């Protein structure tokens, strides 16, 4: 029981660390997709296709 309570705390601390990192990875991917959408597609490529 004591060992499984220690394992529980250690897994909970590892889960919380992954829950902190995961939103930041998603935000970086969203930033790269927004750059591709706004700077490349809507602007740079649109101007190329017009000319």
């Amino acid at each position: 029981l004591q060992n499984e309570q220690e394992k529980h705390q250690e897994m909970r601390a590892l889960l919380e660390k992954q829950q902190e990192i995961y939103p930041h990875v998603l935000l970086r991917c969203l930033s790269l997709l927004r750059q591709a959408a706004s700077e490349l597609r809507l602007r740079a490529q649109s101007d190329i296709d017009r000319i």
């Binding site: 829950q19 995961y22 939103p23 998603l26």
Partner: protein, 50 residues
């Protein structure tokens, strides 16, 4: 037990048994309230992630 529960902070001239039960209930409620706040924080974090 009263010192463990309330700390040295209450200069209560008289410690009562009803006062001891009340501070014991308060520790139990403070733990429950911190679990409920943690669970709300998990839900908010899950909704942000979703």
């Amino acid at each position: 037990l009263y010192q463990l529960l309330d700390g040295d902070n209450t200069q209560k001239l008289f410690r009562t048994y009803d006062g001891l039960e009340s501070v014991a209930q308060k520790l139990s409620q403070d733990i429950a309230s911190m679990r409920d706040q943690l669970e709300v924080s998990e839900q908010e974090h899950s909704l942000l992630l979703s």
